[PDB]
Design a protein around this ligand. Structure first.
Ligand SMILES: O=C(Nc1c[n+]([O-])cc2ccccc12)[C@@H]1CCOc2ccc(Cl)cc21
Ligand SMILES: O=C(Nc1c[n+]([O-])cc2ccccc12)[C@@H]1CCOc2ccc(Cl)cc21
Lengths: 304, 304
């Protein structure tokens, strides 16, 4: 019982974090096998960030200009290449702590853990979601660039995010591990505004199912709805449209609780229209949308 | 920028988790040096839990009746003793991954990370606080007993909690690493009710300071108050009384923001009296109390 915003155990990713310095810029790198991945803006000064031409700035950099430090020991850089917005620094030593891993590009609404680091050292771990506007709401300070987002399936770490920047609104933007930004963001110090941060409907529904499993049932109404009727209300409240794929994905939670997905949609529709009235659901006064149906199942079943 | 409920990196504690089985009961153990710490109810059957006499049940147990497995390898148990509500199983092998550590008994209002485990395997990490009624609001299922709570100061892990039980209300109870329960709870399957779960005032104030640092300033009022006037309102709202020690502890946040502690108390007093009016502070529709002043400073400064 109880329901928490839970992050994956971070040990497997802590064993991959290194410090990358190029000139006077220091950030974090991810060391997997004999390659260190890091944001390509490690080659930029603060002035360069205003309008960087990365291919040009990279011409002035050699292997020896990238200082990679794992713990308090220096790694020898024997190659470097730019792939989209990340640099891959080939080192002469394979990371002995390299876990089984994959690089995945997640979809909006998917959650992941972030191991926030400074100077290649982990400071904390938190859970977040890729927002429908492709930003994330993280917690990152100067030096946190290169911190990664990941999910773990038993012993395989799927890295899905690498932190690159903060927008003027305090929201965050980054890339997958192939260097492609999520959303339309670019690694330049220029005004970039985020789109509408809509609520991940399927995630709210999953968390209402978690609430029912953990005993918070006050919001269960006597109504049902259809996907079309629900979606009319959802659009009005800046909630993402719910599809039959989302209903399918919620099937295991529907079965566990005996509450049909569309009945839970009707309860959510009434919560949107009536508000919480000062009440809480799982200790929250707002509808939480950063638990996927998979996270709810995993947390409520005990997957390790 | 951004402010998250952040847990400590869990790697150092993941390297200590083992599975402890006694007969047909399996839970988690913490392996530090050549000792495995676990809840003493590992010796009980479900029937025994109703009214256990631990000293008597322990007479029927020998070293070979405690099965300790670290990963998929069995540890040899060469001694066992009960200290309060924990069993200490002396093993013949010192844990090679033993980090620098301390056992601390925390005070109500103090936060810590929990590495939730099942069968000695980590499933997730979350942050919580020792409530003023000495319960915690965790996320624990069958088999999670023996999961620990901890804080990290650079490279030293201070273990402060070991999970033992869930109360009928879905809140959690456990001990420090010397086996002493927090609060008045006993390791028996008997009706035990929690006291008032008051709000940790000093923590709410710290989180309002974090909100100001991260740009959420709408709630800043034009008022000030005194500790006595504030505390009259705080008692009425089931908030813990604020002391001059709490004001001292908030001094660094007051200095960072230029907002005097008593002015922030007046803003909190108005939030209590007026409510949020549908607004949010750091993405929350309620006043968060599970960030200590130290956590706010650490997260806003980047301590690794
Ligand atoms: O965004 C950047 N830094 C930081 C990132 N984050 O997330 C938080 C921070 C806080 C406090 C100072 C720095 C921070 C750098 C700094 C300059 O502007 C850009 C523009 C594009 C790119 Cl890809 C990175 C950057
Ligand atoms: O509390 C216990 N289990 C579990 C603990 N927690 O936190 C969640 C759980 C969920 C689902 C089944 C079990 C769970 C056991 C089970 C029996 O009653 C007691 C009474 C006292 C003591 Cl010290 C431990 C226990």
């Amino acid at each position: 019982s109880g329901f928490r915003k839970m992050a994956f155990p971070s040990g497997k990713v802590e064993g991959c974090m290194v410090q990358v310095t190029c000139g006077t810029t220091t950030l974090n790198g991810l060391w997997l096998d004999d390659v260190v991945y890091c944001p390509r803006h490690v080659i930029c000064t603060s002035e360069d960030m205003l309008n960087p031409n990365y291919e040009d700035l990279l011409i002035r950099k050699s292997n020896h200009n990238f200082l990679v430090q794992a713990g308090n020991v220096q790694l020898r850089v024997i190659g470097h290449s730019m792939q989209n917005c990340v640099l891959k620094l080939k080192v002469d030593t394979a990371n002995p702590k390299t876990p089984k891993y994959k690089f995945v590009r997640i979809q909006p609404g998917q959650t992941f853990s972030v191991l926030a680091c400074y100077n290649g050292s982990p400071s904390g771990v938190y859970q977040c979601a890729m927002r429908p506007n492709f930003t994330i709401k993280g917690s990152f300070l100067n030096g946190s660039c290169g911190s990664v987002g990941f999910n773990i399936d038993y012993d395989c770490v799927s890295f899905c995010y690498m932190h690159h920047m903060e927008l003027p609104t305090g929201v965050h933007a980054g890339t997958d591990l192939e260097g492609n930004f999520y959303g339309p963001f670019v690694d330049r110090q220029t005004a970039q505004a985020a789109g509408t941060d809509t609520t991940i409907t399927v995630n709210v529904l999953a968390w209402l199912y978690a609430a029912v499993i953990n005993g918070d049932r006050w919001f269960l109404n006597r109504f049902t709805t259809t996907l079309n009727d629900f979606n009319l209300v959802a659009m009005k409240y800046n909630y993402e449209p719910l599809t039959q794929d989302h209903v399918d994905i919620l099937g295991p939670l529907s079965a566990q609780t005996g509450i049909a997905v569309l009945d839970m949609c009707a309860s959510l529709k009434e919560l949107l229209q009536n508000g919480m009235n000062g009440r809480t659901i799982l200790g929250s006064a707002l509808l939480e949308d950063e638990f996927t149906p998979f996270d709810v199942v995993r947390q409520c079943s005990g997957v390790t």
